[PDB]
Amino acid sequence: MNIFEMLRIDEGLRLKIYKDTEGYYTIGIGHLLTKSPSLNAAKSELDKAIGRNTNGVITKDEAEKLFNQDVDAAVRGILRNAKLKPVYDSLDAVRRAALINMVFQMGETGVAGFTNSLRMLQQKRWDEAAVNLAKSRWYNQTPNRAKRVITTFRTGTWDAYKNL
Ligand SMILES: [Cl-]
Ligand SMILES: [Cl-]
Ligand code: NA
Secondary structure, three states, rough: HHHHHHHHHHHOOOOEEOOOOOEEEEEEEEEEEEOOOOOOHHHHHHHHHHHOOOEOOOOOHHHHHHHHHHEEEHHHHOOOOHHHHHHHHOHHHHHHHHHHHHHHHOOOOOOOHHHHHHHHHHOHHHHHHHHHHHOOOHHOOOOHHHHHHHHHHOOOOOOHHHHO
C-alpha cells in the first residue's frame, strides 16, 4: 500500500465527466474540474487540463497523468503551507499519506484550517486527534472515507485499506 493505491481506493476511476460527492464536475481519479454548475465550463477545464478537445471522455493513461499531477500538487501544497509543513515533517510515512489524502480531497487551505487536529497530530496524541478529526463537516459528509483516513492517523497502519 502507498499514497497512490490509497487514493485510488478512495476516489475510484471514471473516464467520463461525473459529479463528485459535493455535486461538482470531476473526472478520472477524483480530479475536480470546477465548482461551476455549467457542464460546458467543466468540459472547458477538462480540455485545458488534457491539452486537446475531448468529448467529455479521457483515456486511462490520461486519467493517471492527472492523478500523478494531483498527488504532486497535494504534496507541494503541504510543503509550502506554514501550518501543514511542520505537521507533515513530524509524521511517519503512513500518516504522511493520510495527510496527503486529506489535502487531495479538500485542498491545502481546507486542511490547514483543522488547527486543533493538526496540533494533536504534531503532539502524537493519536486517539485524541482521531476523536477531534471526526467533529467536522468532512467526516459527516464522507464518513466511510474519513473513517479510513482517521484510522490511518490513529494507528499508523494501513489496516483500513487492506482486504476491502
Ligand atoms: Cl490540471
Ligand atoms: Cl464516504
Ligand atoms: Na471521486
